[PDB]
Amino acid sequence: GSHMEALIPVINKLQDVFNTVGADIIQLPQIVVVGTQSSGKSSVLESLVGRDLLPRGTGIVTRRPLILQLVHVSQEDKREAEEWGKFLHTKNKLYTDFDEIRQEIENETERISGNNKGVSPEPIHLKIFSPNVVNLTLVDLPGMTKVPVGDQPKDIELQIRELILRFISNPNSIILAVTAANTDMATSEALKISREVDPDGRRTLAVITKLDLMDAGTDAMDVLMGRVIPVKLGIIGVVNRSQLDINNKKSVTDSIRDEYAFLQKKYPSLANRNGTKYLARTLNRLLMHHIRDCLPELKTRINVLAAQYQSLLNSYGRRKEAADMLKALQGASQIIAEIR
């Protein structure tokens, strides 16, 4: 078919097929989530999933990317359960218990790295099927910590920043920069590190969290009217669960009802272009458009790489790297050709 609706599932397959080195070479069209731990980055993800999912962990032994693939289903595809998960690493094991899914994410972050570091580029590959999600994939990267002017940035913090730079240097990456509204957004760590690859914010969309927790005598009006933050793909404000709400087991679904009430109350002029449902629809539309726009460049580069890996492999008579890569490119090429 020619469907815009087939584009996300196609890149979903290429994300499963390529290892981290392969993925760097292919430059896939995808959204990379960049923020501080204190940005509420995690609560943005859970808000799009429609329930809690991520390890509530003080510190992570080995911080890794999460490739989170959200798939919309009808209420009549029940496994019975209307919502379930799969990981690439547990093949076709279906997960109906979301606590079990969270534990499996924690388990995978407890693997010691191939090196001796608290960061690894090896992503956790998780797919969620649900009637309550839009069709959307996000590559969530380990959160930064803002280093107070004069403090010495820790080794682990430099490693988290190198990993972010590795992912967002993908020219076909869209950067979802997350910043709390209760912080100096001019000095956002998310926006600073994004400018190291995207100086004019051409491929950067800003999410502002914690609109409710702003210092009294300040508001988000200027930012949400698009007059402050230099990015080009849009500014969306959200109100997620506070660290209190989480500790109190407040549901994501109820946090969203309370978010819409707040926006309608305080920001009625802006409510229809902000909040969780609008972010979800916006990101779905943006990713579909981005993949459509990148697909011919992707198809070309996949065919040129196949020819180049075929040629290197023929040159031999190391060979395992080349051979696996060539096999993965040949599959990628066939999957892309099934479109128009």
Ligand X SMILES: Cc1ccc(-c2cc(N3CCC3)c3cc(NC(=O)C(C)C)ccc3n2)cc1
Fill in the DSSP letter of residue 311.
H
What gap in Å lies between CA 99 and CA 53, rounded to an integer?
A: 7
User: What angle do the packed helices 252-266 and 41-49 form, to 10 degrees?
Assistant: 110
Distance (Å, rounded) from C-alpha 295 to C-alpha 181?
Answer: 35
Nearer residue to ligand X within complex by CB, 318 or 340: 318
Compare residues 223 and 305 and give the one whose CB is closer to ligand X: 305
Cβ(45)–Cβ(68) under 8 Å? yes
> Is 301 a residue that touches ligand X (CB under 6 A)?
yes
Closest contact distance (angstroms) between CB of 332 and ligand X is 13
User: How big is the CA angle at 205 (ends 204 and 209), to the nearest 5 degrees?
Assistant: 130
Q: From the CB of 251, what's the least distance to ligand X, in Å? A: 45
**Which 8-37 residues touch ligand X, going by CB under 6 A?**
21, 25
Q: Nearest to ligand X by Cβ — which residue?
A: 304
Whether 37 contacts 175, CB under 8 Å = no
Q: List the Cα angle 65/287/126 in 5-degree steps.
A: 35
Q: How far is the CB of 323 from ligand X (least distance, A)?
A: 12
Minimum separation from the CB atom of position 21 to ligand X (A): 6
Closer to ligand X by CB, 24 or 212: give it: 24
Instruction: Select the residue interacting with ligand X from 190, 294, 305, 336 (CB under 6 A).
Output: 305
Binding part of the chain for ligand X, among 140-148, 210-218, 220-228, 299-307 by CB under 6 A, reads 299-307
Least spacing, CB of residue 62 vs ligand X, in Å: 21
**70 belongs to the binding site for ligand X (CB under 6 A):** no
158 lies in the site for ligand X, by CB under 6 A: no
Least distance CB 270 / ligand X (angstroms): 43
Largest CA distance in the chain: 72
Q: Which of 197, 214, 286, 312: binder of ligand X (CB under 6 A)? A: 312
Which among 171, 174, 197, 194 is positioned nearest to 25, based on CA atoms?
Answer: 171
Element (H, E) at 168: helix 155-168
Is 308 one of the binding residues for ligand X (CB under 6 A)?
yes
| Nearest of 92, 91, 1, 72 to residue 335 by alpha carbon | 1
Which of 43, 130, 309, 336 touches ligand X (CB under 6 A)?
309
Cα within 13 Å of Cα(115), Cβ side: 9
Question: Could you list the residues that contact ligand X (CB under 6 A)?
Answer: 21, 25, 301, 304-305, 308-309, 312
